[PDB]
């Protein structure tokens with residue numbers, strides 16, 4: 001009746017309404033470190049988030065999104081495997097009901113507690129709607145989260161969750177700095193893929209960072225307290241909102257380091 005991550009409308013049923021689910025460049029995938037190709041022509045990543053304007057945070061029934069003002073080149077992504085300028089529009093996480101699961105991409109079959117997705121679109125296309133009709137329209141920066149010590153920069157996000165507990169709720173969320181969520185190194189793996197939720201459009205250049213960020217048990221616990229349902233509907237905790245690794249098919253994963 002609408003997709004989800006439940007037994008009856010989860011990832012394994014998505015192909016019925018979204019045929020592209022069995023496509024050739026679907027994400028996420030397992031990153032086999034020994035088979036990825038060191039490509040020395042890949043340039044270093046350029047992250048310019050100093051003029052970033054966050055606006056709102058909302059629970060959309062599948063995850064929570066922090067939205068940004070993308071009317072101008074305030075927060076961009078360039079370099080690496082990219083051609084042109086990509087504007088940050090929003091970021092979200094995927095996580096599990098337990099620490100040994102949660103990420104979408106895996107490294108040598110290893111799953112992390114959660115995964116962060118910073119979503120950007122190609123400025124050459126004018127608006128996001130046009131970008132989703134192109135093979136090089138989007139660029140998502142993936143960052144793994146492992147459980148250990150607390151991440152200061154994440155607490156601001158964790159505190160506001162109580163006000164967006166149920167589907168459809170949103171809270172004002174200004175002056176948040178996304179730079180606080182970055183690992184120390186910007187080394188990455190890259191490959192051509194797709195959105196990991198319906199409509200699953202194959203319009204994404206994936207950039208997965210090698211170095212994960214550390215978050216505390218308490219911080220991750222608060223993500224698990226959110227709800228998939230709207231207010232007044234029976235309660236279903238928001239956990240395990242991640243799609244299983246897909247076949248690599250005819251693709252090659254290139255690394256920016258050896």
Ligand SMILES: NS(=O)(=O)c1ccc(C(=O)NCc2ccc(F)cc2)cc1
Pocket residue numbers: 055067068069070071089090128129130132
């Ligand atoms: N400029 S703003 O802060 O108000 C803004 C923020 C987020 C979004 C969004 O998440 N929708 C994405 C989206 C919508 C349609 C598509 F075809 C592709 C992506 C849209 C506008």
Ligand SMILES: NS(=O)(=O)c1ccc(C(=O)NCc2ccc(F)cc2)cc1
Pocket residue numbers: 117119132140194195196197198199201
């Ligand atoms: N987990 S992920 O990074 O892959 C991801 C990023 C963005 C979106 C999205 O904007 N959906 C809206 C949307 C609606 C209609 C469209 F035609 C296109 C996008 C979905 C998944």
Ligand SMILES: [Hg+2]
Pocket residue numbers: 131132133134135136137201202203
């Ligand atoms: Hg596309």
Ligand SMILES: [Zn+2]
Pocket residue numbers: 092093094117196
């Ligand atoms: Zn995502």
